[PDB]
Amino acid sequence: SMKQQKNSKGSSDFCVKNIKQAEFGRREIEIAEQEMPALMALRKRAQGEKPLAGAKIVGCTHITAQTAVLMETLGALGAQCRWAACNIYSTLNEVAAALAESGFPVFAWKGESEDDFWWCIDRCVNVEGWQPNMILDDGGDLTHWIYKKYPNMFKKIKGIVEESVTGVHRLYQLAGKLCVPAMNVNDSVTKQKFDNLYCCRESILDGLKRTTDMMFGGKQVVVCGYGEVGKGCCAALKAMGSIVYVTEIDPICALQACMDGFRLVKLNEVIRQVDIVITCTGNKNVVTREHLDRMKNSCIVCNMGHSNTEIDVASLRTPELTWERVRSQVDHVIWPDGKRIVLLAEGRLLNLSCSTVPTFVLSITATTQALALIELYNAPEGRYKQDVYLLPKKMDEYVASLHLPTFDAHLTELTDEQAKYLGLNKNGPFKP
Template structure:
């Protein structure tokens, strides 16, 4: 059984700031160091061997059915925690479980896509329920196990649009490359991540899962995963106390010694490193997919406190150029439409941040006729925005005129109270970047402001003079809290995550040190190649002479590590 934990409960606001000298000052040196790594040959050999054993007939069948299936801090940097002692509430009153803003007005805690969702009148907490699957398993905590059948249908739909994971199940399922792996995950729990979890199980892993966002869990999907034997601790509409309780249940189970982490945002890694240091030291690897989680891993590494190898999936080509761009490009409009019924044509919008997420949001909004302004701190990204036809401004310059403000930075307090005090009546404020830190919500939770719940995940924050702003998802991720996301583009990210887990788990002793690594270029290319048949795309094969002329193998990698695509 995992050791008894210190009951100090950390608060999200006390996480460390991004370490500037890691991500700015020494970035080029760090990248050159990490990007020189080579892919473990074992994994590629295994995949090639599996490929060679397939007959032409099986290949044809697979192609037809693939979619079915500060300097003083450098050495003694400390992550700050709340000194207040806290024990998880066993049976608190209903309002005690809800976050402050959620206690102001009622809201649905069910998935947008769940036709069989329970009524929002059901305020009982899953922590107070005793539930079991049809096989008598009870190692989970979700909203309602009776939704499992409907959740299974949603997962089946997602499988149709996630071809690479289905192919990976077929090609590597026999070898079980994750046999013996005990994977703890903290990600969004959606049909798409469910396909990833079940793929990891097919490859031999045991999984326990919690949600990285209190609003993004689809309850029916969580029920289907629990019915399928995966221990899930998550439901839509968790309180902050519930959030950390669920993560702790994933870690502190009897007869469970995890050896791999799949994280989104760094919360699970943060919790284990602080509360379960003996478990943290025995991990074989960490796979992190978000920019915020990567910042935190680099902080640990800089301070000499990262005692396991970690794989940076966020900066892989397949994550940056596909998930961050195309996923946000399609889902930002969906989230805004579902929550506000807004018409985009002619609206004045500010997009804060012009990274890949910001680029996708700007392109989508511009296509529907909005007038898009951009805020940026990075001069390179700012120049890109200018040359793409967007005006680069400071938020305070236009905040009185704009109809929407969308944050996409991965930073904190990008939209402050000084901005919101000056916004026009009815301005829509939402976040597409990270957690709930980009909008200064603390400043809105004051006595003079009134919160009014309008519909699920939509709040009016009303000033004493009657002016109001429309806040979506309490400042959390708009697309995952208020709508759905494209399964196909998430297939690319999920396949990258699966291969990163396999790479770290199966790599020979000593190949990866206690540091943060980038995914090998060959892996990125392999992930992309698995998705090309969906478009009936046919790659041009280089000749030996052409490969020699370019100084590369004709089988790849085709680009150097410094190539930016």
């Protein structure tokens, strides 16, 4: 029983697979620290003034070496933390073990069941003689749990920092029922650059290579949707020598596709000739059963947008069709006449299963979360209110500024005359 474990200090206030993995886990955390200089720089700069002294943070995020560097940064700034996984598969057990040995109440392991998942959140949140005043959440599951099961604890929370798209939607559904301030770091300016364009551009190629070993040259590709995600996928494939067609419902984005040098088509016009279909819409039923029926043999289908509904994968579970798992995250769906399509990640986000977020990008996110937590926790009366807010612009600039040394970038400082000219402070914020 994994529940019967103690760390070297005699505590058992945690639940991890194997506490003896701690030393291996601490080595992986040390590695992440060396790859995240900007988070280490924020830590060192900010720790002396202990701006999270009295912070009692409950977190639900991915339990990786990089998340540990964030957690221990929060600790260095004076916080007390409890933590659970936001996903049943993503936990690095050795990291969970290292955190438990160092004294973090963490309730997390790889391969949790649904019941384990909620059990861990409750153990994270409901503990004798300690109540949270801050939430850090990736998905809103932990937030909702406190909401439904501990309404009076929920009312006392000073701040919710939320990282996910769906988590942010749920906070917006809260109908006058949101009674504490929330900070939407999903739409922070520096984050968005990375999360949308830069990451998807790389991860479309990485995931396609991982799943198919394909060559990109001369592939006919259709990308549905031309927002930032679509733009990024289009640019990546075009740079690798693919021929890319674009679909859109918004004429303004459509015109941009045209100006960017792509043919703008209805899916039907190209469905029968394409080698690759990629959904980037945030919409449902973009690729229908009939589209799938019209696809040529060996056409590859994937989703880079949301959920698993952009492609109607459910429509492929009819008795007539045969599925074969040929590789991790890769199914051949086969028709009676032998025609085959290649479906990736069962139509879930390709990058989540088949690529890895660079540590640098995890640093951008972690840094943003840390500053949002500091901001909500230390905020004066009246500033924030029963509503969803954005990170102050100066803090967003600070995230960028902390990461600039990675590139040996040299920022120019405005002179006094230029600052007056533009109506700005020398220290920012530079844009409204």
